[PDB]
Design a binder for these strands. Structure first.
Lengths: 144, 57, 75, 62, 57, 66, 185, 141, 100, 142
RNA sequence: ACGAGACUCUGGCAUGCUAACUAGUUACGCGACCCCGGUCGGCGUAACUUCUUAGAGGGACAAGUGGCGUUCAGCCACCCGAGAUUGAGCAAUAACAGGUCUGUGAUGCCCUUAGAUGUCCGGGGCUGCACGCGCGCUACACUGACUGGCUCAGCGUGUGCCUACCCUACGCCGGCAGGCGCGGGUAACCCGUUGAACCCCAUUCGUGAUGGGGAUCGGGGAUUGCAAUUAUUC
């Protein structure tokens, strides 16, 4: 209740990332790339769990269930718009791209605009801003 | 009325009416003197009076 | 600079010095117990409602941003 | 140096490098006979008692 | 410009004016633009009476 | 400050040297005598003058004025 | 009742003012007794219209500070209300008597200024204004980036100041003034 | 015996929210577990039973000034859209979540379509509003 | 029978001399008159820079065209209103009569 | 029978409170809700000023209602205070003696000079060249 | 003689005055709910104008008193009172080689005038970035953030002569941005009793670059227009 339970899990090993059990459950999962604060509260809603606990007291069996919902949100009727990568450029799969794939699908499309010599990707190749910013006055830390 | 414009758009459009008189006449009736006008409003009749010094011209 | 490594859930050494020690305190607020027991503020709120229901402390001011408790009747 | 309490009898005028002090003539409450000038800080009314940590420091008049 | 400035100055004086002010600015008698200004009599500058007491041209 | 200008003083002296027998002593009564004996455009000037007239009365009961 | 006035539930009598020099500008007793420290105002239109403003009102007015809090007099009323309910459970005495002794034991008697700075005494009104100053700026620092709420840090300030334990910010910053002014005179 | 305007509003809505639990025929939609209350909101509300809270909060609003439409309802549930770097602005509430509430309250009779537009509460729906309000005063008497 | 008249003007005294002129011709005919209801006067607000260029200290103008309006209601048919409103009118006053 | 009604007003920054005295029992409520149920509750004893400065027995035979619009939260609180404190002093001026009207006025005099005389402070207008009424934008040399 | 003042607007003050079915109030007649009495922006009327609007006058003048001063101008205080300095526009003589010839059908002079510095179209640029400065916005948290809940505004604007384009209620569809439908408003009439935030009330977090902060950048979806690629905005 108020004291430490048995078989505590101080740090969880999820998608080869650390999840400290000290932090609350709805906010500990956010350490994984591709899942933020909004998407964490609904996976803990499609999986029935009182999110007032900490991430180091909850039992081992049902944390396996939330992993199924992460890389497979479709069968748990999570809406299409709620995802991060919708209508993929190659095969058009509405999925939620998690940590290792997120920084894999990141340097998969940067050069896709570079190979086609797109002005969008050329700014990534040139380290400049791309969303149409005025670089006259900012960008002075990473730009010497 | 037909377009039934509001009084804001009605006063100032008739305020622009005055300003276009006191420019049209000063560019034409200046060799004979000009001293402003006074527009008078009546239904189906709008009489303006050209106050000028040389009326015989 | 300095990191206050608080505790998230009590231990039998802390839980022992909470049921005989906290009601001994003259003033009881979740900020004055979070610093003499080295615990978070959530485990300071959550550790005073049962001590309110068991009747070991008395509430004197309940408010959204501030709550304080005291000892029971001296007599 | 025993502490002394002294009550205003008359405000003379302002002084200081920038007009931040009010030169105030004060009489002592423990003995109304002895009275001295003393530069004061802040806004001073008439007749409010002051707390001078020393008494033999007379202030110079301009 | 001098004798014409007077020519309208004393013309309104007999008319019944309290006092006026004529200013003629521009390049006269050379390249650098001076500014002739000949006043007379009584004339106010500031305040709400100026709306109806003087007229400017 | 509140210092009376000349046009409220020179107009208030001529009032006394023309209507000394109609006015009195207090502000309010000779405030309404001033509206009749003189034409004053505004109402602020009505009170400015009539107040100064009573200040001059309290100098007349104690002797002459220059 | 229209006979006795309570600060909600705090008494206003039996708080003797120990300083005869400072009792002029402490509006707390028997005529300046209001249920709430939140009056409409009308205190910044004369030179000493600040004087009859109740000292409990001046404490909340001395709290809304540093940007975000400016203009928020409701929450500092709630702050001082919660702050007062701590003192009776931490010292056992009436909070106002502490606040009276808080002001008296924090106000610098002497203060140095440019005239080579001649040390000169202060007026009691300036001594009040600096007193409510220092035990407010000390509670704002003890609450900043700290778990300890402001309603707690305000209590701890005037509790330590009421005894002069030389540990409170209002006490430390007051002794420095009386030290530097004692230095050059 | 008293009405609702003599009853503390904070201890009324969740008195009415549980009253919308002891019936349980509200036909709450399917996205109630995954929807954001407004564009100015960034999180779903903590309380899982939030569709019951605002159905009660809208109900007392239709008691105080009826004839309110959906456009009226997205305005009362409007908030400070903290726009990050740009200064904040007033953002209206969501329409569908405001519409599904009254579309449920017309189902089980509490509210009906007002003449010339609006949504006013039915007579027998006003009845229980006084009823639950009385027991709140009974909780304090 | 219930004939309204909507008076409007920019200048106030030009209207107040002709608004009361209606009743002074109406009570002559001794018919039922409603009092002119002073509706809230709008004010045309225009602000511009003083300078025609962008030099110098930033100064502005506050231009106003505050516009008054009064409404007299009558209990006379459409034939007697043609004799009262047709007389003693000011140029800068705009007079409108509604039959319903 | 006959109606002993007085409609006394009270203003603030923009908040105007028009009270309504009446003969009867003693009920005191604004907009339908009583003065013990008005938000912000941080200021409850301001709405209780004329009932603790005068006593609950003064409003015994008088029932009062107040309709308020405009202004802000705190401004409405002070609006309701100098409406019902001015309501009882005007009700006790028309229907009973002023020995009972002055004996309630002088208590409301000595406590606070706002329950009877309004505060004439209005928000000062904005001028160009600054963000507020007196403040100016930052001046930059060099 | 000018300027200052005076003057004009504005700010509050007059249960007195002029009057409102485009504004309200109080009664009354029902209606709905709860226990004669209470609530009701739910429903129509005969009085009223405190509240609304805006007209006319009124009120403040250092007027009274107490000190000070040539006891003159006047200062300071106090009583009484809504004010015992509200804010603003207006603004002199002479001058600056201040700015504007990109405000002009104000304009001298010079240049250009058919392969045009005229005009018009297409596209780009006016944003481009080792760096320097200025005006700012958000921040750096617990006097907080978040999530519910409660509860208060005042300035205005709104269907355009050319000109093709208004502000918006209600009801469905949609996570949202939005869309489809039928209405009112040329406006104290509809938006709209402008349910504005802050604040307040109750949850959650607990001093951790933290649920502080939202830059940067990826994917997707709608609206504006002939067109948004250098991301129009959302």
């Amino acid at each position: 209740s108020l004291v430490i339970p048995e078989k505590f899990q101080h740090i969880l090993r999820v998608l080869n990332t650390n999840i400290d059990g000290r932090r609350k459950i709805a906010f500990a999962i956010t350490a994984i790339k591709g899942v933020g604060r909004r998407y964490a509260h609904v996976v803990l809603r499609k999986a029935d769990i009182d999110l007032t606990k900490r991430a180091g007291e909850l039992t081992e069996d049902e944390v396996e269930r939330v992993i199924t919902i992460m890389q497979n949100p479709r069968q748990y009727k999570i809406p299409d718009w709620f995802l991060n990568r919708q209508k993929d450029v190659k095969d058009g799969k509405y999925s939620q791209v998690l940590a290792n794939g997120l920084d894999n699908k990141l340097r998969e499309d940067l050069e896709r605009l570079k190979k086609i010599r797109a002005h969008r990707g050329l700014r990534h190749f040139w380290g400049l801003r791309v969303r149409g910013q005025h670089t006259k006055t900012t960008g002075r830390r990473g730009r010497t | 009325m037909a377009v039934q414009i509001s009084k804001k758009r009605k006063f100032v459009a008739d305020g622009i009416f005055k300003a276009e008189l006191n420019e049209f006449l000063t560019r034409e009736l200046a060799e004979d003197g000009y001293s402003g006008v006074e527009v008078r409003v009546t239904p189906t009749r709008t009489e303006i009076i050209i106050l000028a010094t040389r009326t015989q011209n | 600079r300095d990191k206050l490594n608080n505790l998230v859930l009590f231990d039998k050494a802390t839980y022992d010095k909470l049921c005989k020690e906290v009601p001994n305190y003259k003033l009881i607020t979740p900020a004055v117990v979070s610093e003499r027991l080295k615990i978070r503020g959530s485990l300071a709120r959550a550790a005073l409602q049962e001590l309110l229901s068991k009747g070991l402390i008395k509430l004197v001011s309940k408010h959204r941003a501030q709550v304080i408790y005291t000892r029971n009747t001296k007599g | 140096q025993p502490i002394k309490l002294a009550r205003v009898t008359k405000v003379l005028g302002r002084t200081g490098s920038q007009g931040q002090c009010t030169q105030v003539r004060v009489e002592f409450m423990d003995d109304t006979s002895r009275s001295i000038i003393r530069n004061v800080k802040g806004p001073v009314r008439e007749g409010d008692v002051l707390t001078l940590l020393e008494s033999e420091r007379e202030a110079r008049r301009l | 410009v001098r004798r014409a400035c007077y020519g309208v100055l004393r013309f309104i004086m007999e008319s019944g004016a309290k006092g006026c002010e004529v200013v003629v600015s521009g390049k006269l008698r050379g390249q650098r633009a001076k500014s002739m200004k000949f006043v007379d009599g009584l004339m106010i500058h500031s305040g709400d009476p100026v709306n109806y007491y003087v007229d400017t041209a | 400050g509140r210092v009376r200008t000349k046009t409220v003083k020179k107009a208030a002296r001529v009032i006394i040297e023309k209507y000394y027998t109609r006015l009195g002593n207090d502000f309010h009564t000779n405030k309404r005598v001033c509206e009749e004996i003189a034409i004053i455009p505004s109402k602020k000037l009505r009170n400015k003058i009539a107040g100064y007239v009573t200040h001059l009365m309290k100098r007349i009961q104690r002797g002459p004025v220059r | 009742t229209p006979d006795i006035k309570l600060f909600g539930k705090w008494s206003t009598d039996d708080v003797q003012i120990n300083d005869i020099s400072l009792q002029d500008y402490i509006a707390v007793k028997e005529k300046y007794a209001k249920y709430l420290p939140h009056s409409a105002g009308r205190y910044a239109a004369k030179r000493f219209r600040k004087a009859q403003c109740p000292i409990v009102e001046r404490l909340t007015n001395s709290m809304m500070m540093h940007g975000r809090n400016n203009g928020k007099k409701l929450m500092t009323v709630r702050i001082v209300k919660h702050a007062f309910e701590i003192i009776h459970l931490l010292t056992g005495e009436n909070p106002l008597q502490v606040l009276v002794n808080a002001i008296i034991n924090s106000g610098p008697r002497e203060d140095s200024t440019r005239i080579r700075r001649q040390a000169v005494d202060v007026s009691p009104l300036r001594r009040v204004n600096q007193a409510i100053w220092l035990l407010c700026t000390g509670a704002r620092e003890a609450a900043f980036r700290n778990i300890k709420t402001i309603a707690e840090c305000l209590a701890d300030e005037l509790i330590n100041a009421a005894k002069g334990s030389s540990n409170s910010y209002a006490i430390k910053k007051k002794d420095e003034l009386e030290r530097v002014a004692k230095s050059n005179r | 015996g008293v009405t609702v305007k003599d009853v503390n509003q904070q201890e009324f809505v969740r008195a009415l929210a549980a009253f919308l639990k002891k019936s349980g025929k509200l036909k709450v939609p399917e996205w109630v577990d995954t929807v954001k209350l407004a564009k100015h909101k960034e999180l779903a509300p903590y309380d899982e039973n939030w569709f019951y809270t605002r159905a009660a909060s809208t109900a007392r609003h239709l008691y105080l000034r009826g004839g309110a439409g959906v456009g009226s309802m997205t305005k009362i549930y409007g908030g400070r859209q903290r726009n990050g770097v740009m200064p904040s602005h007033f953002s209206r509430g969501s329409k569908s979540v405001a519409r599904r509430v009254l579309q449920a309250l017309e189902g089980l009779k509490m509210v009906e379509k007002d003449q010339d537009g609006g949504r006013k509460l039915t007579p027998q729906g006003q009845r229980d509003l006084d009823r639950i309000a009385g027991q709140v005063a009974a909780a304090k008497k | 029978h219930r004939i309204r008249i909507t008076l409007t003007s920019r200048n106030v005294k030009s209207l107040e001399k002709v608004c009361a002129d209606l009743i002074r011709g109406a009570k002559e005919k001794n018919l039922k008159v409603k009092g002119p209801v002073r509706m809230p006067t709008k004010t045309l607000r225009i602000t511009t820079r003083k300078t025609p260029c962008g030099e110098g200290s930033k100064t502005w103008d506050r231009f106003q065209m505050r516009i008054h309006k009064r409404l007299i209601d009558l209990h006379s048919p459409s034939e007697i209103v043609k004799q009262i409103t047709s007389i003693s009118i000011e140029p800068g006053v705009e007079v409108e009569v509604t039959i319903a | 029978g006959p109606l002993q009604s007085v409609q006394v007003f009270g203003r603030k920054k923009t908040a105007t409170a028009v009270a309504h005295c009446k003969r009867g029992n003693g009920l005191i409520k604004v907009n339908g809700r009583p003065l013990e149920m008005i938000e912000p509750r941080t200021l409850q004893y301001k709405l209780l000023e004329p009932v603790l400065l005068l006593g609950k027995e003064r409003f015994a035979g008088v029932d009062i209602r107040v309709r308020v619009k405009g202004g802000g939260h705190v401004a409405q609180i002070y609006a309701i205070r100098q409406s019902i404190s001015k309501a009882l002093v005007a009700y006790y001026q028309k229907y009973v003696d002023e020995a009972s009207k002055k004996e309630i006025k002088d208590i409301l005099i000595q406590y606070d000079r706002t329950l009877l005389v309004a505060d004439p402070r209005r928000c000062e207008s904005k001028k160009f060249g600054g963000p507020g009424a007196r403040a100016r934008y930052q001046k930059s040399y060099r």
